[PDB]
Amino acid sequence: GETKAKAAQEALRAAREQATTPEAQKALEELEKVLKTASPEQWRQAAEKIFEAFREASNGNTEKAKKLLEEAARTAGASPEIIKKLASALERLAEEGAAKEAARQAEEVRKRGSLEHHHHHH
Incomplete structure (x- = not known):
């Protein structure tokens, strides 16, 4: 496993x-509604470029990050309507001045994935 x-x-x-x-939080959700229907093999192929886009755009690579976003979407079989929705978030992420929480949020995914599956019920 x-x-x-x-x-x-x-x-x-x-x-x-x-x-x-x-504007980015809602735009990222657009792709995920398609990937919820997409195949698990293509999910790894897509999530690699999807997550690389946010790494590039935050370094100032809006023009590259948008191309990674398109590449992952075409691999997962996703819509031109979600491609433009998500890729628009990358165009702001460069001028927004990066997302410094991404660095610590990635440490969980690098070490294990996550510490926990769920805990809230009441």
Whole structure:
């Protein structure tokens, strides 16, 4: 039983948590509605470029990050309508001045995936 499946979902999920602007948080959710229907093999192939885009755009690579976003979407079989929705968040992420929480949010995914599956019930 391998953590690679958890780490792929957790890459995009953490990107929606760490996104410092409300316009990015809703835009990342758009891709995930398609990936919820997408195949687990393609999910790893996609989440790699999806999460690389946020790494590039925060370093000032809006033009590269948008291309990674398109590449992952075309790999997962996703819509031009979600591609533009998510990729627009990368165009602001460069001028927004990066998302410093991404660095510590990625440490969980690098070490294990996550510390916990769920805990809240009451």
